[PDB]
Amino acid sequence: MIQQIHFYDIPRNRDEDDRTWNPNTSKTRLTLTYKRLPYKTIWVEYPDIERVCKEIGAEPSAFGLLKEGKPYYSLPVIHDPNTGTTISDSIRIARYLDKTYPDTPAVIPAELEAFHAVFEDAFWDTIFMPLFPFLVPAACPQLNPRSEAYFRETREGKFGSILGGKMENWAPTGPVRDDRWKALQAGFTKMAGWLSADGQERPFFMGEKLCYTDIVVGAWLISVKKVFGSDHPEWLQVEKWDGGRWSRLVQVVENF
Amino acid sequence: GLVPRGSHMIQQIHFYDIPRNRDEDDRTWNPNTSKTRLTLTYKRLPYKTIWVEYPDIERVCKEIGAEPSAFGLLKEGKPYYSLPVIHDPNTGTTISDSIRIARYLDKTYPDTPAVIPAELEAFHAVFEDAFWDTIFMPLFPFLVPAACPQLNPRSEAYFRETREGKFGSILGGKMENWAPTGPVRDDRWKALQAGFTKMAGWLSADGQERPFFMGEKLCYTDIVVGAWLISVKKVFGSDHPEWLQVEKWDGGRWSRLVQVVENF
Numbered sequence: 001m002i003q004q005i006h007f008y009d010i011p012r013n014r015d016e017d018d019r020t021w022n023p024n025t026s027k028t029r030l031t032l033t034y035k036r037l038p039y040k041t042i043w044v045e046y047p048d049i050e051r052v053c054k055e056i057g058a059e060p061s062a063f064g065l066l067k068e069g070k071p072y073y074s075l076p077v078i079h080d081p082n083t084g085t086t087i088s089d090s091i092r093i094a095r096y097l098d099k100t101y102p103d104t105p106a107v108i109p110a111e112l113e114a115f116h117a118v119f120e121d122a123f124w125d126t127i128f129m130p131l132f133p134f135l136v137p138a139a140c141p142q143l144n145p146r147s148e149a150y151f152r153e154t155r156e157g158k159f160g161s162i163l164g165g166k167m168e169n170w171a172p173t174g175p176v177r178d179d180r181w182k183a184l185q186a187g188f189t190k191m192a193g194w195l196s197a198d199g200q201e202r203p204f205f206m207g208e209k210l211c212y213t214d215i216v217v218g219a220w221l222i223s224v225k226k227v228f229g230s231d232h233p234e235w236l237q238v239e240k241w242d243g244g245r246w247s248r249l250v251q252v253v254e255n256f
Numbered sequence: 257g258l259v260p261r262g263s264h265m266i267q268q269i270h271f272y273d274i275p276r277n278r279d280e281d282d283r284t285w286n287p288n289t290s291k292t293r294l295t296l297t298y299k300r301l302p303y304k305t306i307w308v309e310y311p312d313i314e315r316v317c318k319e320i321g322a323e324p325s326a327f328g329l330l331k332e333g334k335p336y337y338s339l340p341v342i343h344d345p346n347t348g349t350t351i352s353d354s355i356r357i358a359r360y361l362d363k364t365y366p367d368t369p370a371v372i373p374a375e376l377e378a379f380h381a382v383f384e385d386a387f388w389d390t391i392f393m394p395l396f397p398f399l400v401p402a403a404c405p406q407l408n409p410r411s412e413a414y415f416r417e418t419r420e421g422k423f424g425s426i427l428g429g430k431m432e433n434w435a436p437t438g439p440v441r442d443d444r445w446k447a448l449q450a451g452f453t454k455m456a457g458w459l460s461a462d463g464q465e466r467p468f469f470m471g472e473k474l475c476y477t478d479i480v481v482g483a484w485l486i487s488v489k490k491v492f493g494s495d496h497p498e499w500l501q502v503e504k505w506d507g508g509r510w511s512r513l514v515q516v517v518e519n520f
């Protein structure tokens with residue numbers, strides 16, 4: 001028995017039972033629940049993140065990734081009162097939870113680190129960029145007004161010219177939305193090919209044992225399902241892609 | 257009297273390789289066949305090399321029962337027959353594609369050091385796609401224009417035609433225009449540099465400097481990287497100023513990996 005970990009999450013404008021949504025933060029929430037570690041959520045809205053980080057003393061995760069000159073403060077962040085430690089960046093948190101609690105199933109063993117880093121770069125071009133003009137426009141009006149104004153302005157300032165300016169132009173219903181939906185499906189099919197490269201259909205990257213890179217894929221899937229709604233026609237298609245493999249993974253991480 | 261018992265020693269595996277225009281001992285060079293050559297020597301299995309020119313590869317593959325490795329890589333409707341191929345007379349089995357060859361050798365010779373265990377298969381296929389983008393495409397306008405004039409005439413014509421016909425249109429036309437000395441070569445060299453630093457960054461993602469992707473143990477993934485570096489060295493020459501530059505990339509990681517695969 002130990003104290004509840006402090007898990008800093010980003011809310012949308014919904015009641016608390018439905019307030020979690022974010023892809024990156026879900027990596028850590030799913031890491032905590034896989035390890036069955038007790039936690040409480042502490043909600044921080046987008047425009048308050050760096051201030052809230054600076055006050056509890058969590059490091060930034062990257063540098064100049066929004067404004068070239070200043071560090072990038074992000075969620076997830078955990079504070080573990082059992083050790084007094086504050087950790088930011090979902091992968092740094094996972095290692096922390098591996099080392100602090102060896103009883104829990106290890107998620108990122110040393111043997112996985114370089115291959116998972118390969119995956120993060122593969123996943124960026126293959127899944128994240130095809131998915132971005134879908135998830136981001138859809139999550140934006142779900143935020144409360146201050147969060148939406150910060151989310152819209154920062155993400156339009158960064159990905160704006162690469163996609164078509166304002167978020168309504170990213171995937172507008174028509175030939176635009178059709179082509180991007182195609183390239184998103186291709187990316188998931190490419191990713192299923194990695195999983196079946198030996199001629200079999202393993203459930204997880206390592207085989208039957210699950211690790212952090214399965215959590216990562218699940219976190220983004222859980223985000224799309226939470227943001228679109230589990231009966232949205234575009235989520236219902238994702239459920240069927242590649243033999244329903246993505247549906248099986250979501251089932252796995254939901255039942256952690 | 258006394259009469260021989262039949263020996264049961266491991267017979268030389270037949271390794272099908274692509275020559276260049278040099279004598280026997282400097283005849284290997286190719287990065288894909290090097291994957292399998294290195295897999296054989298890492299496992300310390302006996303093998304002999306059979307030389308096949310590029311335009312003869314398909315005929316040889318069909319003659320010996322080697323399946324194609326892909327579909328439509330050169331002509332839209334046509335199977336792509338490629339080297340490396342081994343034929344193992346110890347089992348009568350012919351295998352194509354460096355990766356399938358690695359699986360066959362792991363399985364058939366289980367007392368040799370394992371190179372592609374099952375728990376690596378999906379991560380390694382991720383790597384081949386990430387490696388294609390960040391290493392292979394930047395490297396292509398350097399390695400192919402240097403290798404091409406080193407081939408025997410029959411392979412030279414076939415290699416120039418097919419590679420220019422497939423890639424030249426997005427690299428400036430004919431091979432002489434892919435990376436000519438001057439700013440074009442220099443900007444492509446920077447892209448290749450950054451590709452390798454991206455790859456070194458994978459290996460240092462935990463803040464440490466593991467020698468191989470897994471840690472202290474090498475696997476098939478390190479062999480793939482070494483085969484491509486060994487090919488660059490063999491084609492450019494060990495004293496080429498550009499090869500000497502690669503030896504100083506990323507704190508010398510690739511030089512150390514080349515050293516590793518050279519002493520298999």
Ligand SMILES: N[C@@H](CCC(=O)N[C@@H](CS)C(=O)NCC(=O)O)C(=O)O
Pocket residue numbers: 010022024027046049050061073074075076088089090091154
């Ligand atoms: N690489 C980080 C990504 C964290 C991240 O980018 N989080 C975003 C949420 S989508 C954030 O909080 N950014 C702060 C901001 O936008 O101001 C991780 O995996 O933890």
Ligand SMILES: N[C@@H](CCC(=O)N[C@@H](CS)C(=O)NCC(=O)O)C(=O)O
Pocket residue numbers: 286288291310313325337338339340352353354355418
């Ligand atoms: N990636 C596969 C394919 C290797 C491959 O494409 N080999 C080339 C040599 S560079 C080949 O034999 N191609 C024959 C041709 O171009 O006709 C493998 O590792 O075996």
